[PDB]
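Allow me, if you will, to draw on your knowledge of protein folds for a short while. I am sending you one protein, given as its amino acid sequence and as whole-number tokens for its backbone shapes. Kindly check, if you would, that the fold set down in the tokens agrees with what the sequence suggests. The record follows directly beneath this note:
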Amino acid sequence: RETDSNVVTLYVTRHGKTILNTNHRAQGWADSPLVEKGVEVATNLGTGLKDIHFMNAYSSDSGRAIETANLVLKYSEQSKLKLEQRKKLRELNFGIFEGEKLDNMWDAVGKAAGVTSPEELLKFSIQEVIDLIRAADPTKQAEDWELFSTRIKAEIDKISEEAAKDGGGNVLVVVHGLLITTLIEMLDSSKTKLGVENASVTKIVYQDGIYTVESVGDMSYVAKGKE
């Protein structure tokens, strides 16, 4: 309860570039390891985070997120900090589209939107785009907005509240592109960005139940590491 003034800073980090990312395929609950270029960039991310002291580290249970978290912990000079994996931090479940070429998925989603080109989908809110993915999936295994947004926010709230109970501090959270876009939309849609890059950092401050989105898809940590 003495937690009210504590500040928690979430370094909400997209994992490094994988095989499926490189081959332009939907990778949600599907997973694949980092490619060497991805390893290089995640290594620079770690170096660029060496002066940020983390109290906790979390990732999804996706191999790509685990691998990236281990690289960041190693190169940020916190190799012994325990990594906590959480299944509720997974990327959106693309259902029938898992592993499909993104061009094929978007053609099928655009058809469900009844739009000429998947181009016009960019006009759509993230809410309606994620809804359209499940609409296009005949198996209805893909998550919709209400499923995804609910589980993402509950888990981020849990991590924030726990960190505040432990005195506040910095928390590394290695997760996924749509999850990040979705979380920003929920917290402060004035800052929402689709397509945050691999190894980018979205810094979110939490205090007394109030979130502040400080940065979105920041590549400065990689660049610091790279110098």
